[PDB]
Amino acid sequence: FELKAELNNEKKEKRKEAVKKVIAAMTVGKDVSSLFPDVVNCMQTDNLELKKLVYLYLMNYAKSQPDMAIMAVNSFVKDCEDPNPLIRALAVRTMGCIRVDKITEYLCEPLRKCLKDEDPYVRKTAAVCVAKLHDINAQMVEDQGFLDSLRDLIADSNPMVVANAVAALSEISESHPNSNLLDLNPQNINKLLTALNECTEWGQIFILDCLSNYNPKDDREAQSICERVTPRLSHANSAVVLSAVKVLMKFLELLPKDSDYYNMLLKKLAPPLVTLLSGEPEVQYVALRNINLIVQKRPEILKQEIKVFFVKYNDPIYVKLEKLDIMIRLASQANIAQVLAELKEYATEVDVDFVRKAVRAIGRCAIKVEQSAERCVSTLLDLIQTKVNYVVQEAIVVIRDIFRKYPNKYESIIATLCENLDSLDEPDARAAMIWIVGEYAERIDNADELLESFLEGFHDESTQVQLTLLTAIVKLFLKKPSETQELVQQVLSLATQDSDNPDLRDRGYIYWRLLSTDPVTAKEVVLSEKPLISEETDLIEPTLLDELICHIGSLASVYHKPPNAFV
Amino acid sequence: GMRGLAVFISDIRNCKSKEAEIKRINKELANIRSKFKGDKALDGYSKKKYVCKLLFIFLLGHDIDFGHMEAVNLLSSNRYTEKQIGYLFISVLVNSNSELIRLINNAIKNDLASRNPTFMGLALHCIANVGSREMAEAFAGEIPKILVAGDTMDSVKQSAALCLLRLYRTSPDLVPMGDWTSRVVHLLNDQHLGVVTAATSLITTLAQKNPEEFKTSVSLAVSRLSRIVTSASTDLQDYTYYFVPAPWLSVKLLRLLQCYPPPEDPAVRGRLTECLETILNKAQEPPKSKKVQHSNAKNAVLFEAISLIIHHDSEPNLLVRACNQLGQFLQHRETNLRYLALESMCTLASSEFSHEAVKTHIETVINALKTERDVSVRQRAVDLLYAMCDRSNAQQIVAEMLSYLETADYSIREEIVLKVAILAEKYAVDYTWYVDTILNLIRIAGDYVSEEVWYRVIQIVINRDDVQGYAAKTVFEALQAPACHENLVKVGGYILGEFGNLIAGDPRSSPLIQFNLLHSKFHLCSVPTRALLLSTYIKFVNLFPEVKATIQDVLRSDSQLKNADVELQQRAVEYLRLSTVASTDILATVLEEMPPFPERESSILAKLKKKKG
Amino acid sequence: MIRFILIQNRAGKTRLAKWYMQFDDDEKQKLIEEVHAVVTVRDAKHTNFVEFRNFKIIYRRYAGLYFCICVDVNDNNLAYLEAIHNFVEVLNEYFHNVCELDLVFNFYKVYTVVDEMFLAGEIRETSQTKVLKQLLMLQSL
Amino acid sequence: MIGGLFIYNHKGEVLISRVYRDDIGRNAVDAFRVNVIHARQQVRSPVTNIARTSFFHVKRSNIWLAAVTKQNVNAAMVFEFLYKMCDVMAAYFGKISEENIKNNFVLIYELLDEILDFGYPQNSETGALKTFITQ
């Protein structure tokens, strides 16, 4: 109760002190909701600092209640006419900050006068307030007039106001009634580029964000935009550079073999992009993700820059992992020795998933080329002999992949793999080992016992392992018909009688209706030779990658997921 | 006071990072090497100081694996502080040894044969605090004669009763049931009400494990309860907690009475009814004190009485009064009271005599769900809503759970979706509503739904036949919407591939359009979804000769044939070779009507049962 | 029954621990950390009966200490809530002033009080008067 | 772009919390306090997704400085903005500590109301802040 007593003061200075005490009490968690009318009464003053403090209080509290805050419209209208522009902008911003259904009717008329005046800061604040309005309860019919006012408000000589107006338009353009933004014709594009030249870093970023939605009619416009965007290599590190890289990569629709500007453009992309690996660790991580996507899209850019992506000892774990795959992306015939030496060096570290991904990278380098395949198979044998469990599982998955890549070349290792089978727990390793056993069942006379051992618990297990086991058993039967009736009958009965998955039941039936129809067709279909796989190494599906090229800057690239997968 | 411990705390508590305290522990190790390893150690003060210092070091968060044999040497002492330090140190740290443990047993055996309450109390506290194999084998049948065959102080009696509780809990095998139960159940009416508390706890545990052994306690228990509930407002002021007469004692007596069936003697149950109406009437009056603790104690004893009434399930008037009290409590200002009332009504909802009375509070339950905006309270509300679910409400109750799913943070989403799935499956008469509800669940939550719910939905759609046409339709008009979650893709692929012949009649849903929509969904999905869509593609090849060429053109590209995953490659090769042969006989023979699923397990119920606890 | 009794501070340090059945070395630390995470997030306008996995704890807020009592599902919440209130009160008129520094200084007194009112997982004595009289009786010697 | 903004303590306390969006509520505070600071899995990434909501965080001295958004903003946007905000705080009051944050609540609130509106970082050079910001 003493809060009210100490707040109800007649001196203006002690009223200000009570105001900051109330702000501090709200910050620490105290509740002064019963003192709101007193603060409203004390609002009627002319002190700037008290004006800001009371406006902060008004936002923080009246955001929860519109009822008694309705009467504040008259005070806001009185405030938005005070000659000085600073408090005008503050008042209009705090007035727009209340998101209620009864404020739009009272703000539709007074807000019009704010968008048309001779002041850059006030115009910027008004544009931001219009963007604030359009978020909620602003579709109307006159709101089209407001958006037209914002749109032709682009015709300003101040970079800040035009930059924020363009950002607001880009954000509000999410609505798509088949009518896309109505604007950014070539003259507006030229004006936007001139502003980009004359803007600040933040509006530069906003303009580069918005500009990535135009479709050039001809190459000359694309050429002009390309040489008008290139000088964008600033001290803003990741933001401006990545936005320029995004817009350039989108504007590579001209023919690859044209006059020698395509090659020079590709040459331009390398220095500033590799420069990004010298900033803060988080922007380094973002740049590494973006470079991974770019290399996966266009691999003839970072061709001879492998040396920089060498993993350092002081780097954090996520940076280490992303530098590792970039390294594997850029490994080729010329850099085999040093890459494999580095991979062997990382293989002895203590961090778990880093060592897993390092041995996977060793195997993937093996997948890429043949001499690396032989040497990396030797290193995989050594790592298997090291007996470490997770390394063994990763090596088994890699060995399955290599067997798929190279047919009938590394048969001598299957006995060693079958020797250590009890150390498998993860579903991927079990599936890989089961497929290896099933495919090379002619060489192994002990495959029956292994598959029967995996057949003990058919339930309480991942569906992928069940499918792999079932297809391996069917393959083994079709290769050893004379003594494998019990296994196939049991596995088919388990699939089609107790499995809850309609996927597994479907596979059980699709094989059951084949093994009893025609053995010639069973041999021809199931055991049909499978073509080579031709450098499948950790690629993203091309449609997803192409859709992700349009979103280089955003979190879509960082998360490696489409924007529709998370709102 | 002791200066050493105070200096220790004041100095080492306010120091720098871990290296400083590590170096100070090293210095302490040097000091103990200097002194304990050899020399001549004093008896009382030095040993007390270093033992308490090492105990404090252990409590700080460090580990000590030595220095207790000379500490257990301290057990045989005359002064109380030394003995307490020794017992506390041997209780806090437990070691695996044979000679030292036997020395501990000899010392405690010598100590137990004392003639003062304090030493026996400390010995019993040490026995009950830890418990061990040697203590169990040596202190099994000799504690009862301290309890039964002895007129000693009350403190040692309570300690011995709780020691019997602990030993029976940890080693029931070697505790006999001999001729000692006569007085232990008889002392339930003893004075000082503390021996009463200990005996009530012990007998309650024993009856919870061995009910028929102590059936005679009912009469004394009900007599004590009747005396306690209404004797006087100023009687035994020592055991009155804020004007409430013995809350904990009454709670424990009510718990003891709950483990037994209603008494055969009509007089005993008559007294029970009398004291129950007495408790309810006493709770009816406005509080005698404005303090919240008085209300908390009164509501505690009232809730225990209500739980006993629910367990008995024999008095209709008592049940009606309890339900009225719960309905009054549903709008109580205190949050704890509302939460406890919700839990108690969820427990009570299983009673058939008050099922309609529980159902009459559905509007208040819905308002509480929509108003308080808590997490535990709203989980209790949805549990009670599930509890009161006879058919009678199915549409409204399912809609309310759907809304609460629409506003549900992280994991209550999963619990709600499982509960809604099982409830809709169990209480649906027109299964078209069930399919619509399932699609609503998939659309609303999507990311956090299940892995078994869509299994069950596919099983229902396949099994029930007649509803398959509407299911296939609604799925088709739901697929082409801009909002299409991943699980919806799988369910739609399976159902539509299986039953496209029912929808092929409409020109708006030509098979070419269905295949194009499925392929448009194909390029952005995980591996299992792509496998399901490939199976649907081959089923279309069986069912739709018109689109045979286009499909065969689809799964022949190098993206879907040279893929990086084993399963997709195998499925593509198999289906492509089946379509290439196309004998028109084998392919039609293979993919048959696929008879409906049998009622195997109803895995949703098992999953939700396992999720509990 | 009463599973464990804790007095956590704002940071997470355990000024009083008491476990009524066997727990491992890492298990105690994991339990303390998860109890702290559960307790510190809730605010004043929340229930005092929060449950995790197979348990439910009864927590109160006194000065800068979080008195946490873990009990079984079937035990009465309000009785144990008033029990922890009574325990805090007995510490109040015992030391005449409750503070974390005093608890650290006289941890053996805290253990003897807890053993006086709690043993084998149940409630031993409920009255303040007899506990105070007995505890001050042994203070002279 | 940016939605809410949060600055946390070493022990898990909340120092300031300013929200620009109706999307961000106390759920964001609970999620970041439980699943980031109190998460036992040290190996993480600077961007974390919790129920379709990204949680960015940068650690300086001993504070968790987190920016929360519910839309696919530019990641470099928020990261560079957080770096520049930390630089501005260091310029105004040197070392960043719990006490330094506590004793300048009004200044921090005024700055964050002025340096950022609704999620559009406006200008943080030095030429605008010095003219019309009180001490």
Side-chain angles (χ1 to χ4, degrees), chain A residues 499-512 514-515 519 522 525-528:
Chain A
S499 312
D500 277 7
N501 197 339
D503 185 1
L504 185 44
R505 182 171 179 267
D506 266 344
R507 287 217 66 92
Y509 273 141
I510 193 66
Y511 287 166
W512 200 349
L514 277 182
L515 305 182
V525 167
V526 182
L527 299 104
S528 172

Side-chain angles (χ1 to χ4, degrees), chain B residues 154-172 174-178 180-207 211 214 216-226 228-234 236-237 239-263 266-273 275-276 278-281 283-284 286-287 289 292-310 312 314 316-350 353-371 374-389 391-404:
Chain B
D154 291 331
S155 63
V156 62
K157 265 179 164 177
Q158 299 196 235
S159 287
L162 286 190
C163 284
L164 284 199
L165 169 50
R166 182 71 170 119
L167 275 296
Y168 182 76
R169 154 178 315 163
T170 188
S171 311
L174 73 165
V175 293
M177 292 305 218
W180 50 279
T181 69
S182 296
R183 279 85 68 193
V184 66
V185 60
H186 155 66
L187 61 83
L188 200 52
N189 78 345
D190 186 74
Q191 195 66 40
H192 203 102
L193 288 187
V195 192
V196 175
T197 313
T200 298
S201 165
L202 162 53
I203 291 159
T204 302
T205 284
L206 287 176
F214 311 98
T216 184
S217 65
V218 180
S219 181
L220 310 96
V222 298
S223 66
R224 204 69 208 195
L225 182 53
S226 65
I228 284 182
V229 167
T230 174
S231 66
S233 293
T234 52
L236 277 296
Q237 183 271 9
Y239 273 35
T240 59
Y241 188 76
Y242 279 9
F243 295 159
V244 191
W248 291 283
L249 191 41
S250 179
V251 167
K252 294 170 91 40
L253 266 295
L254 286 184
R255 186 159 305 297
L256 168 64
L257 290 170
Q258 203 208 320
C259 198
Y260 275 8
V268 184
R269 44 172 320 279
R271 292 180 179 91
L272 276 174
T273 53
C275 65
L276 287 175
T278 304
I279 283 161
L280 275 296
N281 293 316
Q284 185 177 2
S289 184
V292 60
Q293 289 84 353
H294 164 79
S295 173
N296 284 349
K298 178 165 34 155
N299 290 127
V301 68
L302 182 59
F303 279 139
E304 264 297 319
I306 282 154
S307 290
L308 180 76
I309 282 174
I310 298 170
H312 271 92
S314 163
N317 193 4
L318 277 299
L319 286 166
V320 176
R321 298 208 40 163
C323 185
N324 191 1
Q325 188 70 93
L326 290 195
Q328 209 292 304
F329 279 159
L330 277 173
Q331 273 94 40
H332 207 291
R333 181 177 181 170
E334 200 75 26
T335 318
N336 308 301
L337 276 299
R338 288 221 282 277
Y339 171 77
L340 275 177
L342 270 188
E343 206 160 293
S344 175
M345 191 145 48
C346 187
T347 298
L348 187 144
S350 179
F353 287 164
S354 53
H355 184 74
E356 304 293 329
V358 171
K359 269 167 60 140
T360 46
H361 296 283
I362 190 160
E363 182 67 27
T364 61
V365 171
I366 286 167
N367 288 118
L369 183 143
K370 290 179 179 179
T371 300
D374 281 332
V375 189
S376 313
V377 183
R378 293 192 291 172
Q379 283 299 109
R380 289 313 189 281
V382 73
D383 279 331
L384 172 43
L385 281 178
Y386 181 73
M388 62 182 67
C389 194
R391 170 85 209 289
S392 81
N393 290 115
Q395 303 296 322
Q396 174 191 357
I397 289 187
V398 164
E400 291 318 322
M401 268 183 268
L402 281 177
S403 177
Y404 183 39

Side-chain angles (χ1 to χ4, degrees), chain D residues 1-9 12 14-17 19-21 23-25 28-29 31-39 45-58 60-83 85-86 88-94 96-97 100-101 103-104 106-109 111-112 115-116 118-121 124 127-128:
Chain D
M1 311 288 198
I2 288 175
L5 184 59
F6 305 102
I7 298 187
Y8 286 11
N9 199 2
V14 178
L15 276 297
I16 72 160
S17 66
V19 182
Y20 305 155
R21 298 274 185 173
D23 301 331
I24 303 306
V29 176
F32 189 80
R33 206 219 298 271
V34 168
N35 304 147
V36 174
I37 297 169
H38 284 88
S45 58
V47 289
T48 58
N49 189 257
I50 298 194
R52 288 149 152 178
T53 306
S54 68
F55 291 79
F56 310 156
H57 71 87
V58 178
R60 213 151 300 290
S61 170
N62 51 343
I63 62 170
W64 297 92
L65 198 150
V68 182
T69 184
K70 198 142 151 172
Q71 62 181 357
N72 50 359
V73 307
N74 282 36
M77 191 36 48
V78 193
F79 277 123
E80 203 61 26
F81 177 64
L82 297 173
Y83 293 151
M85 174 190 321
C86 290
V88 169
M89 281 196 228
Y92 291 167
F93 50 97
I96 301 98
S97 176
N100 298 115
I101 294 292
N103 64 7
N104 287 317
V106 175
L107 192 162
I108 295 308
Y109 263 109
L111 207 54
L112 276 297
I115 193 66
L116 178 56
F118 204 110
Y120 302 160
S124 79

Side-chain angles (χ1 to χ4, degrees), chain A residues 200-208 210-212 214 216 222 224-234 236 238-249 251-252 254 256 261-266 269-279 281-296 299 302 306 308-311 315-341 343-348 352 354-370 372-381 383-384 386 388-390:
Chain A
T200 187
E201 71 206 9
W202 282 118
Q204 269 162 301
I205 298 169
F206 293 141
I207 290 153
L208 297 185
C210 77
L211 183 62
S212 161
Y214 182 76
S224 51
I225 290 185
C226 281
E227 65 253 6
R228 280 259 273 287
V229 162
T230 300
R232 287 294 162 263
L233 72 165
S234 67
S238 303
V240 174
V241 172
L242 278 168
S243 298
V245 161
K246 182 175 73 175
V247 69
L248 286 174
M249 281 277 319
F251 276 126
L252 262 66
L254 61 83
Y261 176 77
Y262 181 76
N263 279 110
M264 183 177 177
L265 207 50
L266 276 195
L269 283 177
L273 190 45
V274 65
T275 300
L276 259 179
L277 280 76
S278 188
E282 285 89 40
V283 301
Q284 285 196 38
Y285 164 61
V286 169
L288 286 175
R289 292 306 285 249
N290 274 127
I291 290 169
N292 175 26
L293 280 179
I294 289 154
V295 163
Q296 277 182 52
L302 278 298
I306 180 63
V308 66
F309 293 103
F310 274 140
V311 173
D315 285 30
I317 170 167
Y318 43 72
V319 170
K320 287 214 218 153
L321 289 175
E322 207 57 35
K323 291 175 88 74
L324 190 44
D325 288 345
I326 291 182
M327 185 180 288
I328 305 314
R329 294 293 86 193
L330 305 176
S332 293
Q333 187 53 278
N335 305 298
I336 301 299
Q338 65 183 357
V339 161
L340 293 180
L343 292 166
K344 264 182 251 173
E345 212 277 319
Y346 321 127
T348 64
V352 194
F354 186 54
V355 169
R356 280 192 176 181
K357 188 66 180 293
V359 68
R360 175 67 186 269
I362 290 154
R364 204 207 279 120
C365 286
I367 297 169
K368 189 179 290 293
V369 297
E370 301 83 9
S372 302
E374 189 46 87
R375 293 182 183 174
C376 287
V377 173
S378 178
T379 59
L380 282 172
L381 310 193
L383 268 295
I384 283 285
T386 61
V388 184
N389 50 356
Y390 54 85

Side-chain angles (χ1 to χ4, degrees), chain B residues 5-6 9-10 13 52 55-56 59 80 84-85 88 92 124-125 128-129 155 158-159 162-163 165-166 169 192 194 197 201 239 241-242 248 251-252 255 292-293 296-297 299-300 303-304 335-337 339-340 343 374 376-377 380 613, chain C residues 9 14-15 18-21 42 46-51 53 56 73-83 85-86 104-105 107-108 111-112 115-116 118-130 138 141:
Chain B
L5 183 63
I9 297 156
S10 65
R13 177 64 180 86
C52 79
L55 173 44
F56 181 75
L59 290 180
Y80 171 70
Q84 197 253 344
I85 294 295
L88 180 56
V92 168
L124 290 169
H125 284 205
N129 200 359
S155 63
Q158 299 196 235
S159 287
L162 286 190
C163 284
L165 169 50
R166 182 71 170 119
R169 154 178 315 163
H192 203 102
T197 313
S201 165
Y239 273 35
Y241 188 76
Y242 279 9
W248 291 283
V251 167
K252 294 170 91 40
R255 186 159 305 297
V292 60
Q293 289 84 353
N296 284 349
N299 290 127
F303 279 139
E304 264 297 319
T335 318
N336 308 301
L337 276 299
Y339 171 77
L340 275 177
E343 206 160 293
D374 281 332
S376 313
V377 183
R380 289 313 189 281
Chain C
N9 67 337
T14 298
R15 304 321 210 151
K18 179 83 153 136
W19 324 85
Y20 287 102
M21 64 183 73
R42 314 181 81 71
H46 271 236
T47 49
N48 283 324
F49 317 143
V50 65
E51 61 185 0
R53 47 188 185 182
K56 70 182 188 294
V73 286
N74 56 2
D75 291 331
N76 190 298
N77 290 263
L78 270 174
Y80 282 135
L81 189 41
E82 286 297 339
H85 187 291
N86 198 5
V104 173
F105 266 72
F107 66 96
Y108 52 89
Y111 291 167
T112 188
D115 305 318
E116 180 81 66
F118 293 92
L119 195 69
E122 289 275 280
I123 300 166
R124 206 176 86 78
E125 192 70 31
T126 67
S127 179
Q128 307 164 359
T129 292
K130 274 136 192 188
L138 61 83
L141 60 90

